Amino acid sequence: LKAAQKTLFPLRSIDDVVRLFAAELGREEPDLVLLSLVLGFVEHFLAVNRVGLTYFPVADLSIIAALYARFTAQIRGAVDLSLYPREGGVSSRELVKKVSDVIWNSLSRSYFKDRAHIQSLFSFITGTKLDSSGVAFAVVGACQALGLRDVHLALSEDHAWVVFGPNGEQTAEVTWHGKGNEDRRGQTVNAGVAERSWLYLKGSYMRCDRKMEVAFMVCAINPSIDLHTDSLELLQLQQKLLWLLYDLGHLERYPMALGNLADLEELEPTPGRPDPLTLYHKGIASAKTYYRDEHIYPYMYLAGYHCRNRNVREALQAWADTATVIQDYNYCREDEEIYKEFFEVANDVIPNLLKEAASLLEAGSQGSALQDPECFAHLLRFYDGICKWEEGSPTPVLHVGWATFLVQSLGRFEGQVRQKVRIVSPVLTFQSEKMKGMKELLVATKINSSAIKLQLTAQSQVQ
Numbered sequence: 306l307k308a309a310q311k312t313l314f315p316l317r318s319i320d321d322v323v324r325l326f327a328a329e330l331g332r333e334e335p336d337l338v339l340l341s342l343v344l345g346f347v348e349h350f351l352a353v354n355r356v357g358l359t360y361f362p363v364a365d366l367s368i369i370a371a372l373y374a375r376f377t378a379q380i381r382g383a384v385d386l387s388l389y390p391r392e393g394g395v396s397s398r399e400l401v402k403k404v405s406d407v408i409w410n411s412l413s414r415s416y417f418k419d420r421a422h423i424q425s426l427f428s429f430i431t432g433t434k435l436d437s438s439g440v441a442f443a444v445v446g447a448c449q450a451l452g453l454r455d456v457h458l459a460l461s462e463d464h465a466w467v468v469f470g471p472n473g474e475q476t477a478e479v480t481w482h483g484k485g486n487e488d489r490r491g492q493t494v495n496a497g498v499a500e501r502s503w504l505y506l507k508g509s510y511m512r513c514d515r516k517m518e519v520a521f522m523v524c525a526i527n528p529s530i531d532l533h534t535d536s537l538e539l540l541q542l543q544q545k546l547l548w549l550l551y552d553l554g555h556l557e558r559y560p561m562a563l564g565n566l567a568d569l570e571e572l573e574p575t576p577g578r579p580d581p582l583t584l585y586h587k588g589i590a591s592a593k594t595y596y597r598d599e600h601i602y603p604y605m606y607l608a609g610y611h612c613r614n615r616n617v618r619e620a621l622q623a624w625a626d627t628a629t630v631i632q633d634y635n636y637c638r639e640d641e642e643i644y645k646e647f648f649e650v651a652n653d654v655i656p657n658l659l660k661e662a663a664s665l666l667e668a669g670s671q672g673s674a675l676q677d678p679e680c681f682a683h684l685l686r687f688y689d690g691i692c693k694w695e696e697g698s699p700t701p702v703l704h705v706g707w708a709t710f711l712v713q714s715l716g717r718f719e720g721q722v723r724q725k726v727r728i729v730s731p732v733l734t735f736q737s738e739k740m741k742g743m744k745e746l747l748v749a750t751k752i753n754s755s756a757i758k759l760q761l762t763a764q765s766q767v768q
């Protein structure tokens with residue numbers, strides 16, 4: 306550590322931690338290793354072990370510098386740079402693989418790999434444990450510790466790797482994904498980009514600079530103490546650090562960080578700041594501007610906010626928008642997280658929303674989503690995008706499980722509402738062949754349940 310990095314210690318409060326992040330973010334290269342160790346230290350003493358806590362776990366320079374020394378010793382001793390000569394100020398694939406193997410080989414042989422609080426360099430040093438994306442971040446922190454200015458974190462919506470090399474144009478796998486998936490460590494991500502899977506976002510993934518890597522570690526703070534309790538101290542810290550980053554411009558290219566900040570503001574708004582809705586919309590604008598509108602979660606964050614607020618119309622619209630993104634992907638093997646999310650929206654969340662709407666309609670509600678043909682159009686657009694996603698994918702998406710809920714959800718709208726949607730080859734155009742074939746069935750007084758099931762699952766025959 307440099308003398309100027311040490312002058313704010315000891316850190317005695319949330320605001321002292323924010324001052325350290327501001328100071329580092331004002332430097333040429335914010336120090337990822339220092340900042341991750343500080344966040345892991347404070348998270349450990351606020352969420353993992355609160356014994357003796359009276360306000361804030363003071364981070365003394367001696368403690369943090371010792372952890373920093375342990376990390377830098379471990380990386381510098383194990384990775385000999387002279388063996389990997391650097392042309393043009395850029396790293397080689399062999400060097401990036403070496404750093405990734407050093408981190409990997411340091412981890413405990415066996416542990417629950419999706420526990421909370423194993424994301425930071427504090428966990429790596431004190432517990433020899435990291436989660437999947439934590440391994441990728443630790444490789445980028447180790448590379449910065451080694452002076453490898455070209456190695457940066459790459460992020461999709463469900464995975465992490467690194468970019469490096471001439472023009473930052475190379476990619477390398479550095480960590481595992483999911484469970485059971487054989488890992489492709491050391492390889493490029495080009496096969497996954499070429500197959501048009503959600504996991505690699507058709508190439509529209511995030512290439513972080515160092516300030517975005519700071520934003521990633523801030524998003525990675527986990528305030529959870531247990532299943533029903535969060536640390537208010539860590540929530541406040543994360544929220545303040547996200548605002549710092551926002552004010553400096555470093556969330557411009559980071560949709561998920563904007564959604565996380567909107568979620569925090571919903572929980573506890575900061576006076577004089579944008580509303581959660583404005584922030585969800587900025588996340589969607591960011592995805593449109595920098596990522597070809599190929600991200601799913603900007604719309605999912607928005608839908609979840611409208612869902613929690615029972616804005617049924619706007620929740621349906623946002624989930625329809627989610628499906629309009631997914632329709633231009635191929636459902637591939639390791640995309641199971643987004644499949645689980647769409648399955649839960651179609652087969653649990655929407656049905657529960659519409660069941661409540663049906664009860665409130667019975668009680669005299671006006672302006673109900675169930676009487677709005679634009680809402681029925683959003684429900685149809687959601688299923689259309691799911692059906693179009695399925696087209697040209699290796700694995701199928703839909704099955705009879707889904708058909709039961711579709712028939713139920715359609716039946717929540719009276720025929721006189723359903724009949725007002727105009728399906729053009731509210732006005733809606735279908736992209737999927739499944740929904741085009743379903744058109745006549747959708748606007749019938751009594752829903753033909755068996756015919757709908759046949760059309761959605763392309764089941765050839767009946768009993």
Ligand SMILES: FC(F)c1nnc(N2CCN(c3ncnc4sc(CC(F)(F)F)cc34)CC2)s1
Pocket residue numbers: 438460461462463464465521524561562564565602603604605606607609
């Ligand atoms: F839109 C709603 F459904 C969501 N609510 N929380 C969502 N999250 C929680 C925050 N989150 C994230 N937030 C910021 N950055 C990243 S980078 C990343 C992929 C990986 F973990 F690095 F591998 C995930 C992620 C993942 C998605 S989506």
